[PDB]
Amino acid sequence: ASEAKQTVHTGNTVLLMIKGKPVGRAQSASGQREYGTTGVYEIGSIMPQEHVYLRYEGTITVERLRMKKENFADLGYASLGEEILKKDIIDILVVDNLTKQVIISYHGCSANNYNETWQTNEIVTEEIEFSYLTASDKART
Amino acid sequence: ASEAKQTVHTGNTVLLMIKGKPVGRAQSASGQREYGTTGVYEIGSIMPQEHVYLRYEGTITVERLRMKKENFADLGYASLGEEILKKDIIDILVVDNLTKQVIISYHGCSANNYNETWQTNEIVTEEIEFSYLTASDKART
Amino acid sequence: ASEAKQTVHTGNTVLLMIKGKPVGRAQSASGQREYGTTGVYEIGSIMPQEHVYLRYEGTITVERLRMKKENFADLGYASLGEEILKKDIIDILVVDNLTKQVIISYHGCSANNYNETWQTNEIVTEEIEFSYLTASDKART
Amino acid sequence: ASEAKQTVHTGNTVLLMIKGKPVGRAQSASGQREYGTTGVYEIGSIMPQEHVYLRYEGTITVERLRMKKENFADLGYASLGEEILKKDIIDILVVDNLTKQVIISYHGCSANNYNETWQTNEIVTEEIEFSYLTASDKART
Amino acid sequence: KREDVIVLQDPYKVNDGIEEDLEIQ
Amino acid sequence: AITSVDSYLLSEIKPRLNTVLENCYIIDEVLKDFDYQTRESFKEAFCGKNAQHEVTVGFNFPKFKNNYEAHYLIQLGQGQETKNSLGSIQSSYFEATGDTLVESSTAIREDDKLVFTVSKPIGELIKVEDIEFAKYDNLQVEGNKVSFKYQTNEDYENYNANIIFTEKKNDSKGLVKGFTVEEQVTVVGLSFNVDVARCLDAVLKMILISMRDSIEEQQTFQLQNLSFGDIAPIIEDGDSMIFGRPTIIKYTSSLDLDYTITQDINKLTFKERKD
Amino acid sequence: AITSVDSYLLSEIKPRLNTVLENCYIIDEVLKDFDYQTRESFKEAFCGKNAQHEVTVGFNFPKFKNNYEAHYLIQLGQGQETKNSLGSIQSSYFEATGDTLVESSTAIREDDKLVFTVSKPIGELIKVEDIEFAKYDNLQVEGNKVSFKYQTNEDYENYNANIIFTEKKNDSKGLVKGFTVEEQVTVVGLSFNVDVARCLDAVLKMILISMRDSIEEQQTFQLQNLSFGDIAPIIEDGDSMIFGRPTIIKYTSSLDLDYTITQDINKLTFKERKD
Amino acid sequence: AITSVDSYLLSEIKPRLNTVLENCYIIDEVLKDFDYQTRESFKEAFCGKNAQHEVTVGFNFPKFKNNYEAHYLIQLGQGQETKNSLGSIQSSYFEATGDTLVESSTAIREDDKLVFTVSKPIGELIKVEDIEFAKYDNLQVEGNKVSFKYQTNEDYENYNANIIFTEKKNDSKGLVKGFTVEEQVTVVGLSFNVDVARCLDAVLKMILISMRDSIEEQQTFQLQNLSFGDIAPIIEDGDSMIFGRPTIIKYTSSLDLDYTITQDINKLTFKERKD
């Protein structure tokens, strides 16, 4: 039996896709958003009379195991030097394994920092952190 | 036997409710309040002569497992871009499972930051932190 | 046998009392005091010629399990909004279970911050931090 | 057999003494000293030509289990308020259990901060941190 | 098995009025 | 108030289990996942008011025989202490209070008030269903009845309500001494047919869920943690084996005692130093 | 909806296993690593629609004999509770909903609309394959059929599609109470020839992978964790031993119950204080 | 002062247990949770001054027979060292002091003072109940009596009070050497009827709570940690089994010794260098 009213997402029901290509052996991803809320304090009140949105900052991180082929450097998505200046924006999509419907998409993603670890006793891993213009959860049912 | 004089609250005796809707698969929530107490020091005393309240800052966090439906983004409570500017305030209520009486309510809640984690070996989780104008524990017996 | 010359205090020989009322299901409490000692350095010496007391800062924290009744909010000791401004000072007493003699008392306690945690797998807990004017260990034998 | 040429100090061969009184149920103590060494850098050298001593700062901490009698507050060594201003300096001695010879003595000790912890499942502990004028290791054989 | 851990008294037997070792003629 | 978890399980299980097996609709919801064959065979056997076969429940090491066709078996299990409190104090009360009860009542027409009557003295009220008595209502308690004023409430002379209240015994104020106990209890279903055991275990899981809403569970027995063992042959020395899947239930509760205080201060006299 | 993992394994395995053994191309891909001798001997035995020998599957402690030449054996294993939720609440629903289904349908020509018909009432729609209905299409559901408007979609009178939908039962809104259970289940292949066992285990691993795409697995049974034991002689008291490599499967699932609400507020009256 | 925990348990249990079983009101509070049948049957047996049956307590491996109808059994258990101190020093004393006592006394009318008399030399006073002697009272101790001045206390010639004091032996000042020991002790109730055992265990838990207020417990035996095992058949080779639930009690205490000092400095002479 399978009652959809209580289902949740997991690692086996999600795909990470770039330019249609599913990135392989991807391990984890985290998303952050900051609206920069600030309160307004009058003289005759310790309490904040109201809150206001001021600034939108958002970053997304991706952890991956470096495949011998189609690594982020080979794919051209990342960069290692002045080649970065010629790299255009990208959109990173999280799409449902079952229906292939979209769960959340990040628009105008741009790379922030690049990390790779070479270790003796463990598989090679690399991490990338992007900064995006806007997020979207459209194209739903 | 059940002597009410010693009972305490637990995860099985509490409900988290928004706009009447009970949020599903909610895991944890924390509440913080800062009165900004400061002392007054005279010249002829190392001791603080008195303390005074100056500033009220309060935040509440919520941890949840992303259901495939009725997630904070789908519910319209959260936001992912400029849609936030059209989102009005909300009130988050913690209500007793037994009696449906209120334990504590936060008024004029506003969103501060949004966090979601996609991981391979664990269920998806998301965290939201709100900033509220005032708290209340009224409507008791 | 029981030789009092070597006895020590423990959780089973102490009571935490406010306004005569013993607070129930209290778990822990910590007390801090800072005299702000500073040295005096002359030109012809690297060593500090003397130390002097300058400023007295002290805080006490209390951890508790939120009983369904007589919680810090219901007791009126804490506050959740502008109600705080009408709350007067209190004295928090640590008294011996055996003799009901006093061990240490804090005078002119005032609330600094308020923390409460709602969790799924554990009993609800709340923490309060107070700032006090003076401490006393009088009324002994 | 017991060859003294290799012996070391341990918790069973040391006593902590104040004003001749051995403090009871003392657990640990740490001592710190800072000479504030700084280098001198010329224009024509990346290397530091020489180092110089500038400032002597030293602190000692003591951890203890609060006995029902002769606690640091009852002994008059510590203080809880303006009583501190009338407390004179003290000398804290670490003396050998075997010979009663001195190992290290701190002169002109003055109190910096006072910490006490009341906990439910563990014995009560208190911590004191002193600031001293000078240290000495005289009176040896 | 012998009764040592729990012990109950001897049963109440209904007695007969006949005298034992009775002589007759 | 030392809590006998084993007795509580039996008290809750026996009535609720009979009710669940009484109707068929609930059983279908419970056994929705199982295949048709096992589901209906179990229903043919135990389900319905007209069921010839019946389930039983009892404690371990009985000197008689249990219905090994289908039976619930309980054994006390381990216990542990987890959390304490300063002075072992839990709570302070001004009134000697017993259990917490839920009762149903209908409003009665007095002159100035509408009043509900309850089987026992009210002591501490907790809630009347979906009424937020305002100050002008002047809600108050008296003996075994609770009263609120009549005006601007006149449509409610026939109001039918549920009441949550506590049993009052004495005015002797006292303290509570005790601590929290983490206790484990074992439960297992028994049968000579494995399919029955699996159905039986699944039925148990549901009523455990329903017990999470009970008054006793919400107030006294909190923080369920369930653990299931592997299906095993409980017995092999017989014409056929006995199969059962043990389950372990964990609870958090307080072992409390009442300490009464007689040192009530009423008088307070100030006298100045002769000097 | 208590989940019987053991039944789910059998339901998925029996059809899929037969299909895999039916064709030879898939088996070659599965057994690509194995040597030629073992690979073809297994294929000669079980592979193909014309296979005289056949594989069987069943639960433990049966009173009959199993085909010990090649057999899959299952036993329930342990179970544990891992994660809870506040008030044990999982979800809230406005409609009584059953299983989630996938159905295939062809568009039908109505006057204003093109409609698909499904075997049961639609309830909640989830997706129609590769259609993003715009607002001007005015997608809506009616009974057991789903409809979208005709204009600027006229080429699709014969559209052939798959539909994902839920079984609707009642309009009775209710809540869900339950928690997550971490369950382990054991599976083992049996044979009197070790080579067959190794091939048999490898076949199993593949269908476990394929089950990761199943609707039930994606929605209900998540977070696979597989663990393999060492090849051991299961039996020694016979003319020849029985060899089998046990495997352990772990799952995460919810033990849920439906609580129905009848307190539907419809009226709302405001009255001012008499004062 | 090496502490024999086993002896302390017996000393506390034997009197207190008899008192608890003596009255019925306390037992009802203890057995509030249990069902009516078990509660009254136990009360019919052991409760009341007129109880024909009686409970017993003893140590393990006795050469005689114990009352296996109902009995408390104790065995010493493990012990461990947990915390030390510098030089193994615990405390320093100016007077050789024994146990700490609580005694009741009535004030006596002297000329300048009111004095209480106690069975032994006072040594160190700790507290007189609810008296905060001011400096003008000039509280002082003399031999086996404690004295405070009469003026502005004249209403208290008949004052009846409790006194907490220490046993003085010698003026020989000395140090304490020792460390803390974490000790575990086992306790179990025995019966051939399981219901009695459960009632017996619950009675034990209460008196353990009451022992938390005892002078010896507060001063010497601290930090209770209780742990309960599962009900098990202690014996099977007999006409009927013996059932008992073991419990484990943990304590923290000091293993102390007295070291006496004779190097009392009284004279102090200063002499300058001849140069």
The residues, ordered by sequence, that sit 6+ positions from C47 with a Cβ below 8 Å of its Cβ are C41, D56, D133, D134
Q: Do chains A and D touch (3 or more CB pairs under 8 A)?
A: no
Which residues from chain E sit within 8 angstroms of residue H238, using beta carbons? 1, 4-5
**What is the rounded distance in angstroms from the CA atom of residue A129 to the CA atom of residue E16?**
106
Rg, C-alpha atoms of chain C: 19
**What is the rounded distance in angstroms from the CA atom of residue H107 to the CA atom of residue H116?**
5
- Written as six digits, the tokens of F148 are 């609120």
The residues, ordered by sequence, that sit 6+ positions from F154 with a Cβ below 8 Å of its Cβ are none
Q: Does C16 touch chain D (CB under 8 A)?
A: yes
The residues, ordered by sequence, that sit 6+ positions from C36 with a Cβ below 8 Å of its Cβ are B46, C53, C54, C55, C56, C57
Q: Within a 10 A sphere around the Cβ of H73, how many other Cβ atoms?
A: 19
In the DSSP assignment, the letter for residue G85 is: -
Best D67, D77, D80, D84 residue to mutate vs chain C (most C CBs within 10 Å): D80
Which residues from chain B sit within 8 angstroms of residue A35, using beta carbons? 79, 84, 111-114
Residues F94, F97, F101, F104, Cα dihedral to 10°: -60
Distance from the Cα of F140 to chain B's closest Cα (Å) equals: 12
Can you spell out the DSSP letters for E1-25? ----SS--PPP-PPP--PPTT----
Closest alpha carbon to F101 in F130, F79, F121: F121
Q: Which residues of H touch D (CB under 8 A)?
A: 83-92, 175-176, 222-223, 252
- F74: number of CA atoms within 13 Å, CB side? 19
Inter-chain touch F84–C12, beta carbons under 8 Å: yes
Q: Do chains E and D touch (3 or more CB pairs under 8 A)?
A: no
Most distant CA atoms of chain A, gap in Å: 65
| Contact yes or no for B66/B119 (Cβ under 8 A) | no
CA distances from B66 to A10, A33, B26, H141, H266 (A): 9, 17, 9, 73, 80
Three-state DSSP class for residue A64: strand
Closest alpha carbon to F29 in F209, F169, F193: F209
Three-state DSSP class for residue B83: helix
H/E segment holding residue B79:
none
Query: Which experiment gave this structure?
Result: cryo-EM
CA F213 to chain centre: 8
**What is the rounded distance in angstroms from the CA atom of residue A36 to the CA atom of residue A52?**
8
Subunits with 3+ C-beta pairs closer than 8 A to F: B, C, D, G, H
- C133: number of CA atoms within 13 Å, CB side? 12
| CB nearest to D81's CB, from C6, C11, C134 | C134
Distance from the Cα of B133 to chain A's closest Cα (Å) equals: 6
Q: Does B46 touch chain D (CB under 8 A)?
A: yes
**Do the strands G71-75 and G56-59 form a parallel or antiparallel pair, or are they unpaired?**
parallel
Inter-chain touch C123–B8, beta carbons under 8 Å: yes
Three-state DSSP class for residue C78: coil
| Contact yes or no for G140/G146 (Cβ under 8 A) | yes
Per residue, the 3-state secondary structure of chain F, as one string, reads CCCCHHHHHHHHHHHHHHHHHHCCHHHHHHCCCCCHHHHHHHHHHCCCCCCCCCCEEEECCCCCCCCCCCEEEEECCCEEECCCCHHHEEEEECCEEEEEEEEEEECEECCCEEEEECCCCCCCEEEECCCCCCCCCCCEEECCEEEEECCCCHHHCCCEEEEEEEEEEECCCEEEEEEEEEEEEEEEEEECCHHHHHHHHHHHHHHHHHHCCCHHHHHCCEEEEEEECCCEEEECCCCCCEEECEEEEEEEEEEEEEEECCCCCCCCCCCCCCC
Q: Does C80 touch chain A (CB under 8 A)?
A: no
Three-state DSSP class for residue A4: helix
| Contact yes or no for F160/F106 (Cβ under 8 A) | yes
Which residues from chain C sit within 8 angstroms of residue B39, using beta carbons? 57, 131
**What is the rounded distance in angstroms from the CA atom of residue A35 to the CA atom of residue A54?**
6
- Written as six digits, the tokens of A86 are 């010629």
**Do the strands B21-22 and G174-190 form a parallel or antiparallel pair, or are they unpaired?**
unpaired
Q: Does C82 touch chain A (CB under 8 A)?
A: yes
Which residues from chain D sit within 8 angstroms of residue H87, using beta carbons? 11-16, 22, 97
What is the chain E residue with the closest CA to H66?
E5
Inter-chain touch H194–F257, beta carbons under 8 Å: no
DSSP3 helix / strand / coil % (chain C, rounded to 5):
10, 50, 45
Q: Within a 10 A sphere around the Cβ of A101, how many other Cβ atoms?
A: 14
**What is the rounded distance in angstroms from the CA atom of residue H130 to the CA atom of residue B138?**
41
Per residue, the 3-state secondary structure of chain H, as one string, reads CCCCHHHHHHHHHHHHHHHHHHCCHHHHHHCCCCCHHHHHHHHHHCCCCCCCCCCEEEECCCCCCCCCCCEEEEECCCEEECCCCHHHEEEEECCEEEEEEEEEEECEECCCEEEEECCCCCCCEEEECCCCCCCCCCCEEECCEEEEECCCCHHHCCCEEEEEEEEEEECCCEEEEEEEEEEEEEEEEEECCHHHHHHHHHHHHHHHHHHCCCHHHHHCCEEEEEEECCCEEEECCCCCCEEECEEEEEEEEEEEEEEECCCCCCCCCCCCCCC
- Written as six digits, the tokens of F215 are 């008054």
Inter-chain touch G8–F33, beta carbons under 8 Å: yes
H/E segment holding residue G263:
none
What single letter denotes the amino acid at residue A36?
G
Best A45, A46, A49 residue to mutate vs chain C (most C CBs within 10 Å): A46
| Contact yes or no for D78/C53 (Cβ under 8 A) | no
CA distances from F151 to B139, C137, F113, F141, F169 (A): 21, 56, 8, 18, 33
**What is the rounded distance in angstroms from the CA atom of residue H69 to the CA atom of residue H197?**
9
